[PDB]
Structure formats: structure tokens, C-alpha cells
Amino acid sequence: MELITILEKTVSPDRLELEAAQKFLERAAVENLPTFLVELSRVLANPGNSQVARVAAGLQIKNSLTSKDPDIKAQYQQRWLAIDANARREVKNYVLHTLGTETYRPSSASQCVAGIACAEIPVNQWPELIPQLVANVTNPNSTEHMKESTLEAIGYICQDIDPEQLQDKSNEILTAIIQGMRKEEPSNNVKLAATNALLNSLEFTKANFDKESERHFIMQVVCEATQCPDTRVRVAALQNLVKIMSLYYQYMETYMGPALFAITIEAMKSDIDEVALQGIEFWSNVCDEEMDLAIEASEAAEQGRPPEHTSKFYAKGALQYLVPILTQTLTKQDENDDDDDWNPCKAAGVCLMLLATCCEDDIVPHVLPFIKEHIKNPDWRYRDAAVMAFGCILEGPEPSQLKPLVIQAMPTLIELMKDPSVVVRDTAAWTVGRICELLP
């Protein structure tokens, strides 16, 4: 009836037994913080303990180092720094020695390394860590777990610490990340850890994306990963393409034409909602980037000089293959649920609106054919899609250029307000609402 014992009771179904174990652990953090942490790290560090215990130990440690409330988190980070340097040097030592000794997933240690580091790195307090983390991944003998859990830690560190505090280590890290991502890596799990790590390290690899030698390698590595048979790795890989596109638009010429287009397009068509979700996000991101450019460009028009960066109108160039997919995606309607849920359908529509405000006028002639063919369809889905799509293109094409179209639509737009389907009725309403509003 020790600590391992109290920890395991933190998952016991018995309500009384839980609040019990919980109270114990709370005072322990209050009246015995330094010791408590060294003990928990000792539990976590021992591969002889239950997954139940280790994970619990890890959760307690991580809980005394961070919170989602910036204020609380600040308070915890300070409390930790105020702890004896030798106690901390021991917790750090154990937490670290854990990496590569866990059989369960994810790693419960990486969450602790990321916890302590977020408090200690911004103060040059654990200057050894990164070198250690990088060596763990790049050692030619490192186990399949050594790389995976280390990459998860590197990943969490990048995710929660100011990227401003890693640019001076950006090359070391990136090497370790790209290392667990290259196809030669046997494990997709390591490949998965590596890919989510990269996703949070883009913020400070700007110096690396600038060197064409390296940007071509990163991009190839990411691309080969959108082809991974493990859906998770794919989605993670597509997630990078989406962020790379908003953080490095100016360098996408080389790949966009011969690679991205194909990948993202197919992704949008995937049967797997999470993958389709990424494809869409990617082209919404493009419209966004391209819209701010149209501004930055127009602003330089007044100042009679050229803008810093120029748009390449990738969005307008894909209008041909995007529109049909987006409209088709609006067919994947949610009969039953959450008008709060983010499914491909919700995505597509928001995307379309973006595509509209982007390829302003040239959006209508591509959307109409779908609206026409379906506005009067037996399937409530297609009937709603048509009414939906019409509601999306409303804001983009010239206010004047639209009015005539609104002329011929208005009739049917009203009928639908009396359509059986509550969904269609709701949609029709929204659409008609936008009309009366915008174009007086």
C-alpha cells in the first residue's frame, strides 16, 4: 500500500477509492513536492511497473509542471524552478532515463520532458537535454522505442515552448526529426512521431527552408510521407503541407506544379474524412495566403512600387478541379448531427466561400452547372448541396454581376424554404438571407 498502490487507485472504478487516492496525491504535491516528484519519476522510470502505474506516475509529474491556464502554468513553472537544483537534477535524470523503456503508447515520459523543459530551457537550466534528445534519435543503434519516444518529447517541446527559444538549435533538432521521417525508417510509429514533431518545428526552420538544398529534402521527405500506408502518418504529413503552405508560400513553385496539386487533390477525394479534411484545409490556406497577397499587392499599387512578395494564383489555376470536388463534398451532409461538427462538408463550404472571394468572378460559371443540375433533386442532400453552393458563391463575384443570377434563382430559392427537408429549409433560409443583405 505504497505509491504504486495509490497511483493505480487513480483509475479504480470505485468512486470512494478514487477521491481517496486523489486527495493523497494532492497533499503530497503540497506538503512534500520535491520528494513526491523524485518518487513519481522513479516509478515512471522503472520498466518493472504496470502501465497503469507508470502512466499515472507520468500524469502526476506532468500535472505539477503545466496547465492550460497561462496563469496557473506560470505558477507551476516557477514553483519548479524554486525547487532544489539537485532534486530537479534527479527528476530530470529519471524522466530522461525512461525514454526507450516503455512498451505502451504514447510515451508518458515525453510529456514530462516537455514539461520541465518548457520551464527550464528559457532559462538555460537544462542545456544538455536537446543534445541528448538528438543523440538518442540519431544513434545508429538506438532502438525502435528510443527514437519513437524521444521524437515525441522533441515534438512536445517544439509544440509548447516559444519557437523563439530553439532557432539556435533548429539544425540539430531538424536533423533528428528528418531522420525518423526518411523512408529508410522501418517503423511507421517512429515515422509518425517524427512527422508530428516536424509540424511544430516549422516555426523556426525558416533558415533551412531558405537553403534550396535543404528545402528540397524536407519537401521530399514530407511528400514521401503523404504516401505512407499508415493513415496516421499520412494525415500528419498532409498537415505539414498545410502549414508549409502558409509559412513558405514563396517557395512552393518547384513542388506545387508536379507534386502538391496531385497529392492534395487526391487527399480531398479520400474516403477517410480526416484525410479529405487536410486536402481541403490546404487549398483554403492557399486562398487565404493569396487573398492577403492581393492586398499587399494593391497596397503597393498606391505606393507606386512592387510588393515584397507576389501571388502565383494557384487557387485560380485549380478552380477547374477544385470546384467539382468541393460541390461534390457538400453532398456528404450530416442528416443527424452537430451543426458544430467539422466534417468535410463543413470544410468544403467554408473553402468554397474562400475560393469565391478569391477567384471572384470566375467562380460562378464553374458552380452554376452543379446548382442547376441539382437544385431540383430527389435526394435532399444534393438539393441542399445545390442551395448551399449557391449561397457560397454569393460573396466574391461583382455585386452587379450577381444580381441577374439572383433573378432566376430567387424563384426556386423560395420554394425550397418550404422544402420538406429541415436541412434544405435551413440552408435556403441562410442563402436568401445573404441575398437580401448584400445586393440590396
Added chain:
Amino acid sequence: GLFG
């Protein structure tokens, strides 16, 4: 360490 933690102690002494």
C-alpha cells in the same frame, strides 16, 4: 540528489 534529493537527500543529503
